[PDB]
Design a protein around this motif. Structure first.
Motif, PDB file in Angstrom:
ATOM      1  N   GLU A  29      36.837  -4.243  64.971  1.00 49.53           N
ATOM      2  CA  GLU A  29      38.019  -3.390  64.975  1.00 49.53           C
ATOM      3  C   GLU A  29      39.029  -3.820  63.922  1.00 49.53           C
ATOM      4  O   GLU A  29      39.586  -2.982  63.205  1.00 49.53           O
ATOM      5  CB  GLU A  29      38.656  -3.412  66.361  1.00 49.53           C
ATOM      6  N   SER A  30      39.281  -5.126  63.821  1.00 46.57           N
ATOM      7  CA  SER A  30      40.259  -5.627  62.864  1.00 46.57           C
ATOM      8  C   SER A  30      39.822  -5.353  61.435  1.00 46.57           C
ATOM      9  O   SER A  30      40.640  -4.979  60.587  1.00 46.57           O
ATOM     10  CB  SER A  30      40.465  -7.121  63.069  1.00 46.57           C
ATOM     11  N   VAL A  32      37.786  -2.942  60.423  1.00 47.40           N
ATOM     12  CA  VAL A  32      37.890  -1.505  60.180  1.00 47.40           C
ATOM     13  C   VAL A  32      39.341  -1.113  59.936  1.00 47.40           C
ATOM     14  O   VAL A  32      39.647  -0.312  59.042  1.00 47.40           O
ATOM     15  CB  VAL A  32      37.275  -0.729  61.356  1.00 47.40           C
ATOM     16  N   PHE A  33      40.255  -1.709  60.702  1.00 50.57           N
ATOM     17  CA  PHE A  33      41.684  -1.472  60.527  1.00 50.57           C
ATOM     18  C   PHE A  33      42.145  -1.874  59.136  1.00 50.57           C
ATOM     19  O   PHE A  33      42.857  -1.120  58.462  1.00 50.57           O
ATOM     20  CB  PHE A  33      42.452  -2.253  61.595  1.00 50.57           C
ATOM     21  N   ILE A  36      40.885   0.435  56.523  1.00 49.59           N
ATOM     22  CA  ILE A  36      41.667   1.666  56.560  1.00 49.59           C
ATOM     23  C   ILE A  36      42.951   1.473  55.772  1.00 49.59           C
ATOM     24  O   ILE A  36      43.287   2.264  54.882  1.00 49.59           O
ATOM     25  CB  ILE A  36      41.963   2.063  58.017  1.00 49.59           C
ATOM     26  N   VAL A 186      36.155   8.245  59.130  1.00 52.58           N
ATOM     27  CA  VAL A 186      36.847   8.210  60.418  1.00 52.58           C
ATOM     28  C   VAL A 186      37.534   9.536  60.695  1.00 52.58           C
ATOM     29  O   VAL A 186      37.406  10.100  61.787  1.00 52.58           O
ATOM     30  CB  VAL A 186      37.859   7.054  60.479  1.00 52.58           C
ATOM     31  N   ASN A 187      38.270  10.055  59.711  1.00 48.66           N
ATOM     32  CA  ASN A 187      39.083  11.244  59.916  1.00 48.66           C
ATOM     33  C   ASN A 187      38.249  12.472  60.225  1.00 48.66           C
ATOM     34  O   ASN A 187      38.642  13.276  61.073  1.00 48.66           O
ATOM     35  CB  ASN A 187      39.940  11.497  58.675  1.00 48.66           C
TER      36      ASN A 187
END
Lengths: 205, 117, 101, 49, 109
Positions: A29-30, A32-33, A36, A186-187
């Motif tokens: 998660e981190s 990917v964050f 982003i 993602v979007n």
RNA sequence: AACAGUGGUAGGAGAGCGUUCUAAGGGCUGUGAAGCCAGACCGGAAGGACUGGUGGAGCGCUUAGAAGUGAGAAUGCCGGUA
RNA sequence: UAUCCUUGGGAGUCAGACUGCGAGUGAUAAGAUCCGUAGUCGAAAGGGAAACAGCCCAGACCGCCAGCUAAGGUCCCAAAGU
RNA sequence: GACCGAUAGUGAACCAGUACCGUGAGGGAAAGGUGAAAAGCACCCCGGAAGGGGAGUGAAAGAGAUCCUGAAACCGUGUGCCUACAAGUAGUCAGAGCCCGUUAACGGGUGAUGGCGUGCCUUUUGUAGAAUGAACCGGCGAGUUACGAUCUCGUGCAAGGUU
């Protein structure tokens, strides 16, 4: 990594085995964050310049003598507290991008693709051939494939005719098999892939 | 980007000016001195919120003293007699209400006096 | 009318009135009683720390109150010292029935 | 994870310390630099050795 | 219930208010008399607009000349003319030439 | 649950509040948004709602980011008025 | 009783004052200056000494129309024993 | 354009390097917004006009020539309560009386009277200070960025890490 294979008219075929090292990885998660945030900052161009005190067309002389005058002591007419202007620590033209390691970015893109796999919004469309660039044909194709919200299509070879047709939608864009990123993945919440680009990205990763 | 000094100043100054109604003249319309009053008002509020206990206690005490003296008794000897009469958990407020129900105050006073000796 | 020491401060209480006192542990619909009773009034049975048996004061509680805001402001001048703290004090609305002596 | 539920790694983000803004945060009038010092003025550093 | 206003007549509002307050709350037929028989700067102006105020009965809703009284009326400031009168030591002092709004609201009783 | 503690300048640390943009999701708006004006509402705080009046078109919320981000004082500066 | 050491990050401080006691200098003068030692102010509001920073008693997380008390006091102003 | 939205952004959104000041070199401003359409007020009354009151247009006239909205200082007009034996950082808290009735709640306004009580900031050992600054109101107005270094935290790999 065993998503069913679909045809043009919504017909389904035998399921396709997918690379575990790319599509079965537990996402981070981190990472990917941060990926982003990385290109989210990189897209902006940050052009903004505001005139510092030294370059505001004036100033120059001392407005009045220091002592013997009822007014406060004061420098040039162009000054920060002065009305005419001269701002201090304004926005400056500068770059808002940096770089991340190859391992980190590849881990991030693997994480997001595997995340899409595990929440099952991947739909694979082999041999996506359209003889004309008309839009309502692929509109009917998407309605048959039952996609309502945004989407992303990846086809590598048929891009020259699909790209004119699919660019009509504001929320939907084609991408090449090379140009896979994180924001678009993602979007767009629904990843449309072909098997040729599956193997292409598979060997790339 | 640029952030302007928008509605926040109006809201904050209007809050204190709204809270500061009733003050004398400029102190109820001009912020620079209205604000200067309200911290003074806050400090006076806290101080007299603690000072209300003691002057109310003084009021109760002098009323109790009058009640004791008109039964021919000093207040100090009255409470001394009460304390060795027992744990008179009855206290100054409700002894004051016993003054406004004075016959009951008499019925306590003679008990304390007769216990005293 | 009797004297109930309640929450650390005795309140004079009569039969049929309502009193605002500090918030008990009882709920807002069930009657409560105060045991440590003194100065029963009327025929005024009254003893030092009185063990007046059977004189607990039944009382129905109907509110879980929260009193009005007192904005407590602190400052010490010329020193840039500020301390602002809002405050509400809880309470309970009690009506009183069946004074016992 | 979609964008409208973005969570960073906790402990990997820190708020900036805006000095010289009000008194409640501390670092107020003097902006955390004491009083009247040579260091307390703009460009007031001494040579490092 | 009739109303007339002056709308920036060149006169100081205080100098207006001094002769203006004395007609507050009395009968119009003698108020006009006391006002044109007091010598002030403001008296002809308030005389004029007061006669316009009662004159809002002709092509207007009908009242009559008698049994008619000033209900409420006041003088209100208008925009000020900035002027710079020269002054000794080259000081160039500043003076304000004020303008005023005069209101008359008149009702029958 | 129990125990203990809770003045405070320079200072150091931790929690936060608010503003403008920017993405993501959600929706609010001529059946009246923003802003303004008035209320006896809510939170520990910075503040935040609700209801009226004005107003006559834009704006919240959620999460994250980036700041020209918070004024009472500088014989500050400009405008207006005593 | 629980605070001590090591390392690292980040400071401000180098004008102190008064009251005791022990010294200098001074005229064993100073609300003087300069030391050692203790406290307070500094950076500590409350009660007392009329008012008062350093004197005495005592430390403010808030609320209560609760009690007991330290200095000081109890004819009244002004609370408590003519 | 995660640049400004008219004290900003060029000095200059507007007949600006103008007006204005200076002998000259030079310096150098302020000043945007009716309405969708002028459909911009026929006609009547006061008046010399200005300005108003009507009638009319509009969705609005409080929209009528700085004409969207119109805060505050400031200035007026009616009033509910109080005020001519009282000295008071102008409060606070008790508090009778009177008036009103609310985002209904141990309500609101005013307050005769009592107790306590010398503004804010800066600088100082020490300020109610007879030390300094502020006429007031509104707006603007001060720790940022770049490139390196260091430390912590958190991430990816780990005797390798990395362009």
């Amino acid at each position: 990594p065993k998503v069913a294979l679909y045809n043009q008219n919504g017909s389904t075929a035998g399921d396709i085995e997918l690379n575990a090292s790319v599509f079965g990885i537990e996402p981070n998660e981190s990472v990917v964050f941060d990926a982003i945030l990385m290109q989210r900052a990189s897209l902006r161009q940050g052009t903004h310049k505001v005139k510092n005190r030294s370059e505001v067309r004036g100033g120059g002389r001392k407005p009045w003598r220091q002592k013997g005058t009822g007014r406060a002591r004061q420098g040039s007419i162009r000054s920060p507290q002065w009305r005419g202007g001269g701002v201090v620590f304004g926005p400056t033209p500068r770059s808002y991008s940096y770089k991340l390691p190859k391992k980190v970015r590849r881990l991030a893109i693997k994480s997001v693709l595997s995340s899409k796999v595990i929440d099952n919004n991947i739909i694979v469309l082999e041999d996506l051939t359209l003889d004309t660039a008309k839009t309502k044909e692929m509109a009917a194709i998407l309605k048959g494939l039952s996609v309502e919200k945004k989407a992303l299509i990846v086809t590598a070879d048929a891009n020259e005719a699909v790209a004119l047709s699919a660019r009509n939608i504001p929320g939907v864009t084609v991408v090449e098999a090379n140009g896979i990123n994180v924001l678009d993945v993602v979007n767009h919440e629904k990843l449309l892939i072909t098997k040729a680009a599956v193997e292409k990205v598979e060997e790339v990763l | 980007p640029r952030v302007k000094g928008g509605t926040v100043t109006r809201k904050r100054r209007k809050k204190v000016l709204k809270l500061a109604k009733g003050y004398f003249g400029s102190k109820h319309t001009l912020y620079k001195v209205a604000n200067q009053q309200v911290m003074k008002s806050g400090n006076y509020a806290f101080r007299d919120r603690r000072q209300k206990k003691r002057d109310f206690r003084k009021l109760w005490i002098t009323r109790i003293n009058a009640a004791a003296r008109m039964n021919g008794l000093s207040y100090s000897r009255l409470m001394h007699g009460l304390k060795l009469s027992g744990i008179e958990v009855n206290r100054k407020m409700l002894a004051d209400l016993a003054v406004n129900d004075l016959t009951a105050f008499n019925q306590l006073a003679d008990a304390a006096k007769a216990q005293l000796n | 009318y009797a004297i109930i020491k309640t929450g650390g401060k005795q309140i004079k209480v009569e039969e049929g009135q309502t009193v605002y006192i500090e918030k008990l542990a009882a709920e807002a619909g069930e009657t409560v009683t105060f045991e440590d009773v003194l100065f029963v009034g009327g025929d005024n049975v009254k003893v030092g720390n009185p063990t007046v048996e059977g004189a607990t004061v039944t009382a129905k509680v109907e509110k879980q109150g929260r009193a009005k805001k007192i904005t407590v402001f602190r400052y010490k001048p010329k020193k840039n010292v500020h301390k602002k703290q809002g405050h509400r004090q809880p309470y309970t609305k009690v009506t009183i029935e069946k004074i016992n002596a | 994870m979609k964008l409208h539920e973005l969570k960073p790694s906790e402990g990997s983000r820190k708020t900036r310390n805006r000095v010289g803004r009000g008194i409640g945060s501390g670092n107020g009038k003097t902006a955390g630099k004491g009083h009247k010092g040579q260091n307390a003025r703009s460009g007031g550093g001494v040579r490092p050795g | 219930q009739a109303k007339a206003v002056a709308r920036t007549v060149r006169i100081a509002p205080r100098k207006a208010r001094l002769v203006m307050d004395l007609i507050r709350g009395k009968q119009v037929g003698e108020a006009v008399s006391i006002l044109n028989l007091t010598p002030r700067a403001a008296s002809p102006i308030i005389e004029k607009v007061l006669k316009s105020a009662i004159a809002n009965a002709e092509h207007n809703y009908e009242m009559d000349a008698n049994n008619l009284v000033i209900s409420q009326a006041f003088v209100d400031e208008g925009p000020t003319l900035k002027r710079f009168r020269p002054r000794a030591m080259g000081r160039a002092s500043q003076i304000n030439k004020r303008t005023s709004h005069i209101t008359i609201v008149v009702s029958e009783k």
